[PDB]
Design a protein around this ligand. Structure first.
Ligand SMILES: O=C1c2c(O)c(=O)ccn2N([C@@H]2c3ccccc3SCc3c2ccc(F)c3F)[C@@H]2COCCN12
Ligand SMILES: [Mn+2]
Ligand SMILES: [Mn+2]
Length: 179
C-alpha cells in the first residue's frame, strides 16, 4: 500500500475514487500499483465534473465517468441526433449550447505542450480542447474558454490545492516526474 493510494482516498470524495477504479479496471490497470495514474484519473474526473457544473442546467452531456461501452453509446446518440461527426477518440463532455465535444486535459507540464499533444492526437478539428495545469494556467481551442471565468477559476484553485496537498506529503515530486 502506497502513501499515494491513502492520500488519494482521503483527498477525493468516494464517488470519484470509485469511478476512477472502475476506469482503471476497464483498461486492466491496478490502482494499487499504478498509483500516480490513480491520482491523475481522480484529478481529471473531479475537473470534468467541476467543468460540467459550470454551465446552465442541461448544457453538458458528461461522457467521462462511464464505462467504455456506455461512453461510446452516448457519443453515438449525440452524433446520430445532432449530426456532428463521430470522433475517433472518446471525448470528455459534449456542449449542447456550442454543439461540440470537449476534451479536457490536466497537465503537470506547461499547458502549451500538452495541448499540442492532444491536438496532434485527436486529429479531429471539431473536438474543442481545454487544458488546465497545476499552476493556474489554461489553454482552450480558438481562445474560446466555454465557461465564464469564475467557473474556470474554481478548477484552477482546486488543482493548486491538490498540488500543495501532495507536496505536504512529499508525493508531489514523484507525481510531476511521471508524465
Ligand atoms: O478519457 C480518457 C482520458 C482522458 O480523457 C484524458 O484527458 C487523459 C487520459 N485519458 N485516459 C485515462 C486517463 C484519464 C485521466 C488521467 C490519466 C489517464 S491515463 C490513461 C488511462 C485512463 C483511464 C484508465 C486507465 F486505466 C488509463 F490507463 C483514457 C485514454 O483512452 C480513452 C479513455 N481515457
Ligand atoms: Mn476522457
Ligand atoms: Mn480528458
Amino acid at each position: 500500500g502506497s502513501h499515494m493510494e491513502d492520500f488519494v482516498r482521503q483527498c477525493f470524495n468516494p464517488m470519484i475514487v470509485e469511478l476512477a477504479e472502475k476506469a482503471m479496471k476497464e483498461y486492466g490497470e491496478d490502482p494499487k500499483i499504478e498509483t500516480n495514474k490513480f491520482a491523475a484519473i481522480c484529478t481529471h474526473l473531479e475537473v470534468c465534473f467541476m467543468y460540467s457544473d459550470g454551465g446552465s442546467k442541461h448544457r453538458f452531456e458528461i461522457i467521462e465517468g462511464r464505462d467504455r461501452i456506455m461512453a461510446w453509446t452516448v457519443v453515438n446518440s449525440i452524433c446520430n441526433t445532432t449530426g456532428v461527426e463521430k470522433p475517433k477518440f472518446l471525448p470528455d463532455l459534449y456542449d449542447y449550447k456550442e454543439n461540440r465535444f470537449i476534451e479536457i486535459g490536466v497537465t503537470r507540464r506547461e499547458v502549451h505542450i500538452y495541448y499540442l499533444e492532444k491536438a496532434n492526437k485527436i486529429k479531429s478539428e471539431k473536438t474543442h480542447i481545454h487544458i488546465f495545469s497545476f499552476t493556474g494556467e489554461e489553454m482552450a481551442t480558438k481562445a474560446d474558454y466555454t465557461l465564464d471565468e469564475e467557473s474556470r477559476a474554481r478548477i484552477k484553485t482546486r488543482l493548486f490545492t491538490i498540488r500543495q496537498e501532495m507536496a505536504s506529503r512529499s508525493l508531489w515530486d514523484s507525481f510531476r516526474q511521471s508524465e
